[PDB]
Amino acid sequence: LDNSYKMDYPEMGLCIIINNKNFHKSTGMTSRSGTDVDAANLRETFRNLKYEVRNKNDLTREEIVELMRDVSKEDHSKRSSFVCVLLSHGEAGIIFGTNGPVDLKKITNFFRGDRCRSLTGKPKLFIIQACRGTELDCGIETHKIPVEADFLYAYSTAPGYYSWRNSKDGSWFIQSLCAMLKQYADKLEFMHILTRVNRKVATEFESFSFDATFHAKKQIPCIVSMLTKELYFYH
């Protein structure tokens, strides 16, 4: 059978990590304290999964687009997959460069099946730690293929909600993601790993704030899958 992506190419693939911590004063966006902890954790976690990791810090929206364009124009024929990690401010459908916003659609389109042929039929993973709006979760006590196929978006939070980051320990989502990848990459299919990430973020984290509006809030991550096969990081 062929229910799983071929992951035994000579290379696992690129892991591009865009780490935006400091923003242009004119944007009025706050510094993302704790994001370096996230970036270092993802670097180490994906290095051990045998990805070629490229860390990028504090990119403008222009730099983000050009980087994605360039990476998409690379020959990935010897690569099993592609991973892109986005750490920034955001809103619905949007990620922030240091000087202003970027359509998530614009970035991901570069990797469409018809636009990056050396990635066609291969899993393209986008991992996004950024807000998707301003809602807060109060909680409750207990032969052609489509050009959009083979994408997976691991969002940190539900549609329309804030996403939480701790200035000391890093973002809830990324710390949980890394720990689950470390413990389970040699054992579970990726969807099942991300379900455990969901549970850990949902159960183990709750906000502490002096501001009643922001206190005692919860978060649930959002897996969006257009994959056509099971994904195992091992072979």
Binding site: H89, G90, S156, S163, W164, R165, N166, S167, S207, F214
Partner: peptide, 4 residues
């Protein structure tokens, strides 16, 4: 804790 802070929001993104």
């Amino acid at each position: 804790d802070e929001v993104d």
